[PDB]
Design a protein around this ligand. Sequence first.
Ligand SMILES: CN(C(=O)c1cc2c(C(=O)N3CCCCC3)[nH]nc2cc1O)c1ccc(N2CCOCC2)cc1
Length: 207
Amino acid sequence: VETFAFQAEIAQLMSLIINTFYSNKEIFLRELISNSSDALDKIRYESLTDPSKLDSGKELHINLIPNKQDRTLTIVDTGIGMTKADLINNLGTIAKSGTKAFMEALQAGADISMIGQFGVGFYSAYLVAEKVTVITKHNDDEQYAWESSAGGSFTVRTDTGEPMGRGTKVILHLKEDQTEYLEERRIKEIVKKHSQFIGYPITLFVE
Ligand SMILES: CN(C(=O)c1cc2c(C(=O)N3CCCCC3)[nH]nc2cc1O)c1ccc(N2CCOCC2)cc1
């Protein structure tokens, strides 16, 4: 298990997300489904020049898996996935600029719901989750587990769990007062409101 400090601006945004009073918490799901759709668009596009990139799985979809017993909401996609270098350096380097721009926009009157315009919508997961676990598998790398309970640090390890084939699985360990996001009717309403035109099948698993 390797422990890393988040870039200062990212840690700052995570504290702002956790500490700001903001009732419209449901936007976290739109943001995560969007990121899934982008990873799916990426593998679809790449497989046009290299069809072998779909050897790890041809199906392009999103699964929404609530678990009341574990108090977890899992968002699974069969997108391009992420390499170790993406999880540790690449995505965070880029997110540094988006994060700074977003925090400046909030100071100028913008709302937390506009987070996606700055490419840092992922951090909206901390509106509802005390801990986020990300399992990922890219064709060019091994399966990794990224994890953070905020507090300025995250961990990355090789994942010895069930092999994913290709894609990303976001496991949200929900805050005790955010269990409405495990309810089928609540998840259906959010998907219909914010993610109605996503170009991939979104399957909501029932318990
Ligand atoms: C390739 N890819 C993924 O496989 C993937 C990443 C996800 C995150 C996330 O953002 N993570 C999770 C781990 C810590 C870093 C952040 N959340 N849900 C995700 C679902 C996914 O399929 C990916 C997809 C979209 C993006 N951004 C969209 C917005 O513009 C900036 C790039 C970046 C990478």
